[PDB]
Short mmCIF file of C-alpha atoms and ligand atoms in Angstrom, two decimals:
data_model
loop_
_atom_site.label_atom_id
_atom_site.label_comp_id
_atom_site.label_asym_id
_atom_site.label_seq_id
_atom_site.Cartn_x
_atom_site.Cartn_y
_atom_site.Cartn_z
CA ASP A 28 0.00 0.00 0.01
CA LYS A 29 1.47 3.38 -1.25
CA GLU A 30 -0.82 5.47 1.06
CA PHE A 31 0.53 3.62 4.13
CA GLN A 32 4.20 3.75 2.88
CA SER A 33 3.65 7.52 2.47
CA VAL A 34 2.61 7.72 6.20
CA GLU A 35 5.65 5.63 7.28
CA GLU A 36 7.95 7.94 5.23
CA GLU A 37 6.49 11.07 6.87
CA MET A 38 6.88 9.48 10.29
CA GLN A 39 10.55 8.50 9.69
CA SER A 40 11.79 11.52 7.67
CA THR A 41 10.47 14.16 10.14
CA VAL A 42 12.48 12.86 13.13
CA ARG A 43 14.88 15.52 14.53
CA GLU A 44 17.46 15.62 17.32
CA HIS A 45 15.81 17.17 20.37
CA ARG A 46 17.34 19.91 22.54
CA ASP A 47 16.40 17.98 25.74
CA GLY A 48 18.80 15.15 24.65
CA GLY A 49 15.91 12.67 24.51
CA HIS A 50 14.63 13.38 28.06
CA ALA A 51 10.92 13.62 27.11
CA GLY A 52 10.59 11.18 24.19
CA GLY A 53 13.60 8.87 24.43
CA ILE A 54 16.86 8.40 22.49
CA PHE A 55 16.41 7.31 18.85
CA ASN A 56 17.01 8.27 15.24
CA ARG A 57 14.22 6.09 13.77
CA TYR A 58 11.14 4.02 14.63
CA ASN A 59 10.03 0.44 14.18
CA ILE A 60 6.56 1.04 12.58
CA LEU A 61 4.29 -1.86 13.60
CA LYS A 62 0.88 -0.89 12.28
CA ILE A 63 -0.82 1.95 10.48
CA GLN A 64 -4.60 1.96 10.63
CA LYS A 65 -6.89 4.39 8.79
CA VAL A 66 -9.58 5.73 11.17
CA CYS A 67 -13.04 5.72 9.59
CA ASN A 68 -15.41 7.55 11.94
CA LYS A 69 -18.22 9.03 9.77
CA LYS A 70 -19.69 11.28 12.48
CA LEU A 71 -16.20 12.80 13.22
CA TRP A 72 -15.39 13.12 9.48
CA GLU A 73 -18.51 15.12 8.84
CA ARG A 74 -17.99 17.35 11.87
CA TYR A 75 -14.48 17.93 10.40
CA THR A 76 -15.61 18.55 6.75
CA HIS A 77 -18.47 20.80 7.85
CA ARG A 78 -16.03 22.99 9.79
CA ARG A 79 -13.44 22.82 6.98
CA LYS A 80 -15.99 24.25 4.48
CA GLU A 81 -16.85 27.13 6.92
CA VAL A 82 -13.18 27.93 7.49
CA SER A 83 -12.46 27.79 3.65
CA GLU A 84 -15.33 30.31 3.10
CA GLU A 85 -13.74 32.62 5.73
CA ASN A 86 -10.23 32.22 4.21
CA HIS A 87 -10.40 33.17 0.52
CA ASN A 88 -11.89 29.64 -0.50
CA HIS A 89 -8.88 27.89 1.12
CA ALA A 90 -8.99 25.56 4.12
CA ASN A 91 -5.16 25.61 4.56
CA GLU A 92 -5.30 21.93 5.55
CA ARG A 93 -2.16 20.15 6.65
CA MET A 94 -1.29 16.58 7.68
CA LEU A 95 0.24 16.89 11.16
CA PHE A 96 1.22 14.61 14.06
CA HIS A 97 -0.41 14.51 17.49
CA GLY A 98 0.86 12.60 20.51
CA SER A 99 -1.34 11.94 23.57
CA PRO A 100 -2.00 9.32 26.23
CA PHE A 101 -5.69 9.70 25.13
CA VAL A 102 -5.48 8.55 21.49
CA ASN A 103 -8.29 5.92 22.06
CA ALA A 104 -10.72 8.59 23.33
CA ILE A 105 -9.71 10.86 20.38
CA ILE A 106 -10.41 8.25 17.70
CA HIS A 107 -13.87 7.59 19.22
CA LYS A 108 -14.98 11.06 20.43
CA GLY A 109 -12.69 13.37 18.39
CA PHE A 110 -10.46 16.22 19.53
CA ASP A 111 -11.98 18.23 22.32
CA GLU A 112 -10.89 21.77 23.18
CA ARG A 113 -12.68 21.35 26.60
CA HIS A 114 -9.69 19.13 27.57
CA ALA A 115 -7.30 22.00 26.69
CA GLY A 116 -1.25 26.14 29.84
CA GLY A 117 0.80 25.71 26.76
CA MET A 118 2.95 28.31 25.09
CA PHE A 119 -0.11 29.34 22.99
CA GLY A 120 -2.70 28.79 25.70
CA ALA A 121 -5.81 26.52 25.70
CA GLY A 122 -5.45 24.88 22.34
CA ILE A 123 -4.90 21.48 20.76
CA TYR A 124 -1.29 21.14 19.60
CA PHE A 125 0.14 19.45 16.53
CA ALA A 126 3.65 19.05 15.09
CA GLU A 127 5.09 18.64 11.59
CA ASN A 128 7.96 16.57 13.21
CA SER A 129 6.86 13.10 14.38
CA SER A 130 9.61 13.09 17.11
CA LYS A 131 8.17 16.30 18.64
CA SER A 132 4.71 14.59 18.94
CA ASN A 133 6.45 11.47 20.35
CA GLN A 134 7.52 13.68 23.39
CA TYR A 135 3.77 13.86 24.36
CA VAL A 136 2.68 10.22 24.01
CA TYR A 137 3.20 9.45 27.71
CA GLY A 138 2.21 12.89 28.97
CA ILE A 139 3.62 16.42 29.21
CA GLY A 140 7.41 16.19 28.98
CA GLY A 141 6.93 12.42 28.48
CA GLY A 142 5.35 12.06 31.95
CA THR A 143 6.87 9.05 33.77
CA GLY A 144 7.19 7.15 30.47
CA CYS A 145 5.58 3.79 29.62
CA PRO A 146 3.03 2.31 32.14
CA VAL A 147 4.96 -1.03 32.46
CA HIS A 148 8.64 0.11 32.93
CA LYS A 149 8.20 3.86 33.81
CA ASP A 150 10.77 4.59 31.08
CA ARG A 151 10.43 7.66 28.76
CA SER A 152 13.01 5.91 26.49
CA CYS A 153 11.33 2.49 26.50
CA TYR A 154 12.24 0.46 23.38
CA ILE A 155 9.95 -2.41 24.40
CA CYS A 156 6.50 -0.89 24.85
CA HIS A 157 4.45 -0.06 21.77
CA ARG A 158 3.53 3.62 21.39
CA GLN A 159 0.73 5.20 19.40
CA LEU A 160 0.72 8.55 17.51
CA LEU A 161 -1.97 10.11 15.36
CA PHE A 162 -1.31 11.55 11.87
CA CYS A 163 -4.13 14.08 11.45
CA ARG A 164 -5.92 16.20 8.92
CA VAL A 165 -5.78 19.72 10.46
CA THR A 166 -7.61 22.79 9.13
CA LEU A 167 -5.45 25.83 9.88
CA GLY A 168 -7.41 28.39 7.87
CA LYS A 169 -6.02 31.92 8.38
CA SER A 170 -3.17 31.01 10.75
CA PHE A 171 -1.73 33.60 13.15
CA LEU A 172 2.10 33.44 12.98
CA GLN A 173 3.73 33.78 16.46
CA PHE A 174 7.27 33.39 17.82
CA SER A 175 6.89 34.09 21.54
CA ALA A 176 4.40 32.84 24.17
CA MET A 177 0.88 34.13 23.63
CA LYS A 178 -1.57 32.53 26.09
CA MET A 179 -4.82 32.48 24.08
CA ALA A 180 -8.19 31.02 25.06
CA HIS A 181 -9.39 31.10 21.41
CA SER A 182 -7.96 31.87 17.94
CA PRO A 183 -6.90 35.50 17.55
CA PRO A 184 -9.67 37.73 16.03
CA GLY A 185 -10.17 36.93 12.30
CA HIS A 186 -8.00 33.79 12.55
CA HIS A 187 -8.62 30.02 12.75
CA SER A 188 -5.36 28.74 14.33
CA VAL A 189 -1.92 29.78 15.60
CA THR A 190 1.39 28.71 14.02
CA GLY A 191 4.37 28.75 16.38
CA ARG A 192 7.49 29.44 14.33
CA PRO A 193 11.07 28.64 15.53
CA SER A 194 12.99 31.61 17.11
CA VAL A 195 16.41 32.09 18.91
CA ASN A 196 14.77 32.72 22.31
CA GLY A 197 11.91 30.27 21.72
CA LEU A 198 10.78 27.23 19.77
CA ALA A 199 13.27 24.74 18.26
CA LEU A 200 10.61 23.37 15.87
CA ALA A 201 7.21 24.54 14.55
CA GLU A 202 3.89 23.76 16.22
CA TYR A 203 0.30 24.31 15.10
CA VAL A 204 -2.52 25.11 17.46
CA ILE A 205 -6.28 24.97 17.00
CA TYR A 206 -8.87 26.11 19.54
CA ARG A 207 -11.89 24.13 18.20
CA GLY A 208 -11.75 20.32 18.28
CA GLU A 209 -13.72 19.99 15.03
CA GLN A 210 -10.76 21.53 13.09
CA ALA A 211 -8.82 18.21 13.21
CA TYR A 212 -9.59 14.65 12.14
CA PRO A 213 -7.50 11.73 13.52
CA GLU A 214 -6.98 10.04 10.13
CA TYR A 215 -4.22 7.53 10.90
CA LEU A 216 -3.38 5.65 14.08
CA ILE A 217 0.30 4.66 14.03
CA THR A 218 1.52 1.88 16.41
CA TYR A 219 5.34 1.95 16.74
CA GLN A 220 8.39 1.65 18.91
CA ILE A 221 11.32 4.06 19.15
CA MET A 222 14.52 2.16 18.15
CA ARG A 223 17.78 2.04 20.02
CA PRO A 224 20.44 3.99 17.97
N1 LIG B 24 2.70 22.30 23.92
C1 LIG B 24 2.63 21.25 23.04
C2 LIG B 24 3.47 21.28 21.83
C3 LIG B 24 3.41 20.26 20.89
C4 LIG B 24 2.52 19.14 21.10
O1 LIG B 24 2.54 18.15 20.10
C5 LIG B 24 1.61 17.04 20.22
O2 LIG B 24 1.72 16.21 19.37
C6 LIG B 24 0.70 17.03 21.36
C7 LIG B 24 0.75 17.93 22.37
C8 LIG B 24 1.66 19.08 22.27
C9 LIG B 24 1.75 20.16 23.19
I1 LIG B 24 0.49 20.13 24.79
ZN1 LIG B 25 8.05 -0.01 28.68
#
C-alpha cells in the first residue's frame, strides 16, 4: 500500500534531534513502525468537513489543511470522540497542539514532557513498549504566525489557528494550534516503537 508507505515515510523523515537530549521522548534516530490503521469515523469526518468548508469560506476559498502529528495518552478517546478543546497552559494557551515533526509529537505520548514514560517500565526511552501517535488532517485556515508565548483562550480575532514558528529565544521546531476540536480529524493511528540507535 502506497498510502501507508507515504505515512511511514512522513513518520521516519520528520525525526529531529531534540534539545532535551531525549529526556521527554527517548533516544532514537528512527522508529520500528508496527501498524498503520486508517480511522473511519463518519460522524467525526462530517464534523471535520463541515467546519473545513466554513473555514475555507472565511479564508479566501482555502482551508489551509495540513497533515500533522499529535501525541497523547488519550489517542483511544480521540479516535472515538474526536479532539476536544474542553480538555485544553501551553505556550499558545488553551489549544490542541500538533507538530510537523513526528519526534516532537512522540515527546507527548506518555504525557507532558513524556510524563513518567511507559506504564509497564516507567521509562520515557522504552524500546519495548508499543507507542501510538496520530497523523491528522488539520484545518489551519487563516493562521496567526507567532514566535513568543501568547496565552490564548481562542484563535486571535479573524484567525482560525496559531502557528508557532522557531525563534532564537523560543521554539526549536514549529507547532500548530487549534482552539476548536472539530478543526482536526484523527486520520491515521500509528503503532510503533522508538529504536535504540
Ligand atoms: N505544547 C505542546 C506542543 C506540541 C505538542 O505536540 C503534540 O503532538 C501534542 C501535544 C503538544 C503540546 I500540549
Ligand atoms: Zn516499557
